[PDB]
Structure 1
């Protein structure tokens, strides 16, 4: 692989790459805008050492005094049902509702796991409120304390709108200490100075400054039984989430994921990429039919289609290739199902019939042939009925309206399709057809599925394989040709079908084999 190859692959997979990168960036931006902002407050303490003082500041004695003074064991959180309800409410300009509680004694369930009892407070108005611990409803008012059902609660100064719910947890003293200790850090900043930098993170900018002031003052009173230089102030710019580094990572992560997925699809695909791959093995490619964007025949409904023009090129190439053959019978056989053989063979018959030639189309796919459905069908007396002996040759030939050629349907699906084609009536039909027509085109099932095409190929003077652009493999075509040759059927060449324009073909090889549209635009 070279620079041209990888750049062509990027150009071809640009849509997948952009989609993956864009969804990654969207997730990164949604995270950076919905994650709760965490502020950081700092303070400065003058020590008259400071290494044992650092461990004393983070001790449960100093921090425990802060939990008790500020009631940090009363956890109050705004209620939001999703994991994004808090982020989007902040985006919508909704100010976070807050309630002040000074006394909270829950019945202390203290079960196997839930050591943190919780209730749900629903704001009814500015004054009164409701409480539901486990469905037990209790109505309370600011001021008057509540002592009912083993639940003591004192809510002061409800600052919110009616309908706001609040999860009120009474976490144990050690947990409240452990939460404060996890967000509280102490540094020396000079490693020799008597200066300690107390920092505290949290989602509430005002609350974390009151806590850090309490920690500094409780440590101050404890030491005198030291100087506070800078009291705790909260940085108004949140330190997390760091939006820029999250979005940039979302871009880089989306890009590298896109590349490795594209790099795998390039290294794992085995389908045909160009007619050159077939010609490298010695397989003559007579036409490359591009994908048509469009029950009528394409060569009649849209004669100017880019696919029909490539079929006209096949017509002229076949005319020079079909001379010096045994007979005027041309067999067309896809290598795999859904290769587009009936698309090519029926439109090829149309492009040759308009040239004034008498063409007979034989849908000899007794298993899955649908040429009768496509042309309009008196489905009785098809090819099956003729091979079985219950129909004459003149009774199975029909004319296509949007055609120009005669066509023979497969008939009713026989139980022994391969055995019917071996009947001598089949060769007698082709010998009779070879005298009343200029060209006989025969659709056959794929040789890698059944052997029907090998039997029919014995009576055809020219045999062509139909390969799908990306669905069929080069070796798949080579096995198909060798299977025909093993049964005495020489394949004249292959027809690549369903070619799509790709930039990687333009850089790996010097051509894309898609075809130029050519008309005066009017």
Structure 2
């Protein structure tokens, strides 16, 4: 491989690359803007050692004392239903509410799993509130204590707007101690001095400084039954989430996944990409037809279409190839369905009719031929009725209205399509038509699916295959050619159909307007 190939591949897949990178970067931005910020407070302690003091600070006696002093076993969480409600509320500038609770005693359900009882408190005004544990609604008032239904509560100084809801949990003392220990750090910072740096993290910048001051006071008071050089203050800039590294990670991750996905698609492609793939195998390509982005004949509705220009190129190529052919019959076939055989056949018939030659178009697709719909029809008396013997050769020929050539439709779909085509009446029809017309074009079903084209091809002096631009593979076309050669039918060459513009190609068609 070379760099031009990969650059063209990136240019072609730019829509997917951009979409994937933008999606990943949007998710990264949403996380870096909706994650709750985490602040850090710290304090500095003087030791007159300092290895066992580190274990004494993190022990459950000191931390438990702090938790008892500060009532850290009463967890209060402002309620937002979604997982992004809190982040949005912070972004909108809404001030978070808080409640001071000095006494809480839940009935302590203490079942197998839920060791932490919790209730929901809804604020009705600055004074009263509603409480529900499991649907049991009670009304309480700030100030006066509540002792009802096995529930004790004392609420002071509700500072929020009415309608807010708060989850109040009474978690066990060990759970509180473990929570405090997880966010608490002690370090020496000199490895030999009596200086210890205590650190604490949390989402409330005032609460963490109060908690660290309590820890320092408890440790100092316990030791004298040590000097606090720096009492706890909180850095106002949150330490998490780290926004810029998150966004950079998101962008780079999006780019790498996009690149590997494009590499995956490029390594898994097998369709035809240029006429050179067919010409390596030894197959003549007579034209490349682009997709016309424009029940009508294209060569009649839009004669100045680019696909019709490419078909005029095919017309001039054929006028030279079909010299020294045994008769004036051309058969168009292909490997797979919806490659474009009917499109090519009918539009070629129209462009050859505009030059003043008499053209007969035969729809010999007895299984799915729709040419009568595309030309305007009297669907009675098609090729079926003629072959089965219930029609004559003069009742089946009709005129294309905006075209200028004659045609024969398929007729009624028969039960034995391949066997009807083997009747000698088919060759009688071809020999009769070959004397009243300058050209006969026969449209057929694909050869890999059924065998009708190989029957028809015995009486055609020229045979061309239609290959679809991206769908078909080189192996398909080669197998189709060999299946034709085995039945005694020589295939003159190929027509590539439905070509589109690709930056990776480096093959230049003339698929652009000139005028």
TM-score by length of 1: 0.96
Describe the shift of the 1:123–1:423 C-alpha distance in structure 2 as closer, same or farther (beyond 3 A). Answer: same
Offset from partner CA, 1:478-512 (integer Å, 9 cap, x none):
00111111111111111111111101101899999
Deviation of 1:396 (Å): 1.5
The answer as to whether partners of 2:306 and 2:511 remain within 8 angstroms in 1 is no
Separation (CA, whole Å) in 2 of partners of 1:342 and 1:216: 88
Describe the shift of the 1:12–1:129 C-alpha distance in structure 2 as closer, same or farther (beyond 3 A). Answer: same
The answer as to whether partners of 2:292 and 2:305 remain within 8 angstroms in 1 is yes
The answer as to whether partners of 1:468 and 1:498 remain within 8 angstroms in 2 is yes
The answer as to whether partners of 2:306 and 2:513 remain within 8 angstroms in 1 is no
Describe the shift of the 1:400–1:513 C-alpha distance in structure 2 as closer, same or farther (beyond 3 A). Answer: closer
SS in 2 for 1:228: strand
The answer as to whether partners of 1:290 and 1:306 remain within 8 angstroms in 2 is yes
Offset from partner CA, 1:430-458 (integer Å, 9 cap, x none):
11221121111111111111111111111
- State whether structure 2 residue 380 is matched by structure 1 residue 380: yes
The answer as to whether partners of 2:274 and 2:507 remain within 8 angstroms in 1 is no
TM-score by length of 2: 0.97
Describe the shift of the 1:2–1:184 C-alpha distance in structure 2 as closer, same or farther (beyond 3 A). Answer: same
Offset from partner CA, 1:58-94 (integer Å, 9 cap, x none):
1111111121111111111111111111111111111
Separation (CA, whole Å) in 1 of partners of 2:508 and 2:72: 68
Separation (CA, whole Å) in 1 of partners of 2:219 and 2:370: 90
Separation (CA, whole Å) in 1 of partners of 2:112 and 2:507: 68
SS in 2 for 1:513: coil
Separation (CA, whole Å) in 1 of partners of 2:395 and 2:209: 98
SS in 2 for 1:389: coil
The answer as to whether partners of 2:334 and 2:480 remain within 8 angstroms in 1 is no
Separation (CA, whole Å) in 2 of partners of 1:398 and 1:511: 34
The answer as to whether partners of 2:290 and 2:511 remain within 8 angstroms in 1 is no
**Which residue of structure 1 aligns with residue 239 of structure 2?**
239
Deviates more, 1:489-498 or 1:387-396: 387-396
Deviates more, 1:98-107 or 1:29-38: 98-107
- State whether structure 2 residue 423 is matched by structure 1 residue 431: no
Offset from partner CA, 1:4-31 (integer Å, 9 cap, x none):
1111111111110000011000111011
Describe the shift of the 1:74–1:307 C-alpha distance in structure 2 as closer, same or farther (beyond 3 A). Answer: same
| Structure 2 alignment gaps of length 5 or more | none
- 4+ residue segments displaced more than 2 Å: 507-515
**Pairs within 5 Å for 1:47-446:** 47-446=47-446
Offset from partner CA, 1:91-148 (integer Å, 9 cap, x none):
1111112112111111111111111111111111111111111111111111111111
Offset from partner CA, 1:363-400 (integer Å, 9 cap, x none):
11111211122222222222222211122222221211
The answer as to whether partners of 1:5 and 1:507 remain within 8 angstroms in 2 is no
Offset from partner CA, 1:232-281 (integer Å, 9 cap, x none):
11111111111111111111100000011100100011001111100010
Separation (CA, whole Å) in 1 of partners of 2:101 and 2:90: 23
SS in 2 for 1:365: coil
Separation (CA, whole Å) in 1 of partners of 2:514 and 2:29: 41
Describe the shift of the 1:514–1:174 C-alpha distance in structure 2 as closer, same or farther (beyond 3 A). Answer: farther
**Which residue of structure 2 aligns with residue 520 of structure 1?**
none
Separation (CA, whole Å) in 2 of partners of 1:470 and 1:477: 13
SS in 1 for 2:346: helix
Deviation of 1:402 (Å): 2.3
SS in 1 for 2:494: strand
SS in 1 for 2:287: strand
Describe the shift of the 1:509–1:104 C-alpha distance in structure 2 as closer, same or farther (beyond 3 A). Answer: farther
Separation (CA, whole Å) in 2 of partners of 1:271 and 1:213: 72
The answer as to whether partners of 2:358 and 2:438 remain within 8 angstroms in 1 is yes
Deviates more, 1:379-388 or 1:32-41: 379-388
| Structure 1 alignment gaps of length 5 or more | 516-522
SS in 1 for 2:36: coil
The answer as to whether partners of 1:127 and 1:158 remain within 8 angstroms in 2 is yes
Describe the shift of the 1:509–1:346 C-alpha distance in structure 2 as closer, same or farther (beyond 3 A). Answer: closer
Describe the shift of the 1:411–1:508 C-alpha distance in structure 2 as closer, same or farther (beyond 3 A). Answer: closer
Describe the shift of the 1:510–1:290 C-alpha distance in structure 2 as closer, same or farther (beyond 3 A). Answer: closer
Separation (CA, whole Å) in 1 of partners of 2:440 and 2:165: 81
Separation (CA, whole Å) in 2 of partners of 1:195 and 1:368: 91
Separation (CA, whole Å) in 2 of partners of 1:388 and 1:322: 31
Separation (CA, whole Å) in 2 of partners of 1:275 and 1:262: 24
Separation (CA, whole Å) in 2 of partners of 1:385 and 1:227: 111
Separation (CA, whole Å) in 1 of partners of 2:508 and 2:197: 62
Describe the shift of the 1:507–1:287 C-alpha distance in structure 2 as closer, same or farther (beyond 3 A). Answer: closer
Deviation of 1:513 (Å): 14
Deviation of 1:224 (Å): 1.3
SS in 2 for 1:185: strand
Separation (CA, whole Å) in 2 of partners of 1:398 and 1:509: 37
Separation (CA, whole Å) in 1 of partners of 2:489 and 2:89: 74
The answer as to whether partners of 1:358 and 1:439 remain within 8 angstroms in 2 is yes
Describe the shift of the 1:417–1:367 C-alpha distance in structure 2 as closer, same or farther (beyond 3 A). Answer: same
Separation (CA, whole Å) in 2 of partners of 1:333 and 1:26: 50
Deviation of 1:334 (Å): 2.1
The answer as to whether partners of 1:499 and 1:513 remain within 8 angstroms in 2 is no
Deviates more, 1:151-160 or 1:475-484: 151-160
Describe the shift of the 1:402–1:151 C-alpha distance in structure 2 as closer, same or farther (beyond 3 A). Answer: farther
Describe the shift of the 1:298–1:510 C-alpha distance in structure 2 as closer, same or farther (beyond 3 A). Answer: closer
Separation (CA, whole Å) in 1 of partners of 2:494 and 2:323: 17
Describe the shift of the 1:48–1:264 C-alpha distance in structure 2 as closer, same or farther (beyond 3 A). Answer: same
The answer as to whether partners of 2:458 and 2:489 remain within 8 angstroms in 1 is yes
